[PDB]
Amino acid sequence: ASVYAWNRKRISNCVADYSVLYNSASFSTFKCYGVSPTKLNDLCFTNVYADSFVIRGDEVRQIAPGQTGKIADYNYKLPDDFTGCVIAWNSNNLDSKVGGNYNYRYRLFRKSNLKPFERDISTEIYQAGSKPCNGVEGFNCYFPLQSYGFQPTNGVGYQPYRVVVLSFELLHAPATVCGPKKSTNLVKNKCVNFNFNGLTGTGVLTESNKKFLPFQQFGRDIADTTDAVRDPQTLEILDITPCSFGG
């Protein structure tokens, strides 16, 4: 959808692979502001908001925190405290039309600058002088929205660029989306350390014949000392023995 009617998408309760988005040559511009793109796979928030639209080639710089311009003030706004990333890429091969893809429209006139994370789709005629515009356009009457004359041959400056702005919110609600886990393989009969499903400890792992009920995850014998764990992948009962020591 157009920049003044930017598509808003909410992402929650899933796992996000930011590495593949980073490792994609189809995106010309990829600028992050919260954390480094590689570290993004590690930390996480409670939900993600995507603002996707198409603009001119020269207006990508306008979409940035602390930036001003026609798009940056009249179609969409990014606050200074913005957390997340912006991903832009040329779309002249697809969005631009030989006959003119005039469907894309951008706001040019508005009384007030748009607030952050706010959308304006008003098509009311704008007045710049003193005489009010009573309907039909007159002297001081210019339409707030102007179409895009996208053509395959328009120079790099005017090519249609698709822009998606990703914001991350971590409200008091429990987190719903996080990155990958990249679990390793399993070894036996060796003194090693482990972090099974967030439970860390040292020792040696052997096979056990204990019969967990179908809902426990780990079992301890007495004095609160873990003895057996269930592997999250194979779902079998293991046994933990402390590594040998003496005098």
Next chain:
Amino acid sequence: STIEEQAKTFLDKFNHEAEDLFYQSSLASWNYNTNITEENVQNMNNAGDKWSAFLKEQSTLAQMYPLQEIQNLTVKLQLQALQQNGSSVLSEDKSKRLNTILNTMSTIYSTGKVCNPDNPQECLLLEPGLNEIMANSLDYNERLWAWESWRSEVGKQLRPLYEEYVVLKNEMARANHYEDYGDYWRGDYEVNGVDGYDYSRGQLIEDVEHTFEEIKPLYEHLHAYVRAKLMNAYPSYISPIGCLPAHLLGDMWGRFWTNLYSLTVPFGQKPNIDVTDAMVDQAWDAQRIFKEAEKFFVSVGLPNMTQGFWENSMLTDPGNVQKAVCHPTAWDLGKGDFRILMCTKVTMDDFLTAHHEMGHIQYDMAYAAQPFLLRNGANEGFHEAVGEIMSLSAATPKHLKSIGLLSPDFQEDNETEINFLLKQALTIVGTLPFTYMLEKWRWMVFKGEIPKDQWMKKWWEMKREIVGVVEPVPHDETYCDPASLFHVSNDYSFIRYYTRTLYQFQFQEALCQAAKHEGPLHKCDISNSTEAGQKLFNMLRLGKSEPWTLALENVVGAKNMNVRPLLNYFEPLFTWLKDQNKNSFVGWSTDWSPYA
């Protein structure tokens, strides 16, 4: 809100919708000049009125603004282009009569018909032929007859037509609040803004000759040398006290003396600098020449050209029915569309022409960031001068040896230096007096200083003092001889050519000083000197956003137009001519004539 905000909003609405229409019209024009077909013709009509149906309508929305209080210079100057009365202030009958007379005068001038009396069934036009015959011939009778015939079939019947054209254009001049059309013509070199840079239109009139008196002695020595060479070739046709006629200059106008260079060659023993045979040996096609010239442009300091030009732009050999008129042109179609149009071939002349056209392209790049109404240079001569700068610079042996055009063991001497300098002066300084007198004659005929009768005799008698041309045949009142010229039948300002040479010479001299080069000025090269390119582009980016007086402040330190670089360039030629034609006295007589 104040009216200034309304004007700004009007301009912001106007330029966005003007860009698309201008791009479409320019694309259609480029396609037709690249694809000569019937369909692209009506499109011009289909665009033409349409463009008017936009622009004039936008002009219709550009009168109610009181354009005298906008503090912002850029906005007011941009709106000034839209606040032009034009020919609409004239009555409809007057406008249609002006259109009809312009059309008929242009058609008559472009349809010249000269039939030799022995074979009246075959006339000739400005197309190759008679043009070539008078451009390259060694005779006194055929050239004179061709000149007389052309002046008879273009100037005899154009006296009332030229009179009415001039008087109606001047009536339009008063209708546009101008007491003379010369003011409208000179308004290009005019500014009334920033203090210390304002220039009056009438000041250019005196500046034209104030920069011309210094080349008068050098022009006199060149005239004496040419006269001596004519006496060597032509026997007893030009008296030493007198001067050569118009038809012996190689053209019926005597605009350029390059046609007469063969007769007046300084030293034909040493060949000129030409590597076209080496160009064929090196196998430099259009693509290789274009790439090498673009590399030279980058080494100068100009940015590399954007992608997409190498495909859309035609380069060489239209070939089949898919024809293309390939007059050298640089197209700024708008919306970041820059293209070239030329029959580029394996030729040194084509090499320089390609350099000129891509210099025009680079200057189009320079003012691309300016708004639609400001997508032009400070003055019309700046574009041509900038396009000619690097073309002139690339002719030096240093650039040729840098890319191995000339032989690696090439050595230059004073003989070929003098030959090349005189050859260049026969075209550069050999046309300045003619342009000067033509522009002054146009100014005075538009001002109405001379009465109806005293038009042709005054022109011919003043050509004797200014150009140095005698009359082999008389033209008192039944001829209009300057009317048989390209820039007389299309309402063309002729000051641009006079200013272009001075501007390009000033820029070349300034870059030569700020380019770490030593020796003669004619050998100065700006290749692999990024500082010179940056200095040039600093002024290039200005465009129409800055006055021409302010524009002449980055490359050169003087805002005014000066002649010193012109004489600095032809210093060896002046020294050689001081002792060359010592026996032949300098000067000519305006009383001697071939008839009496």
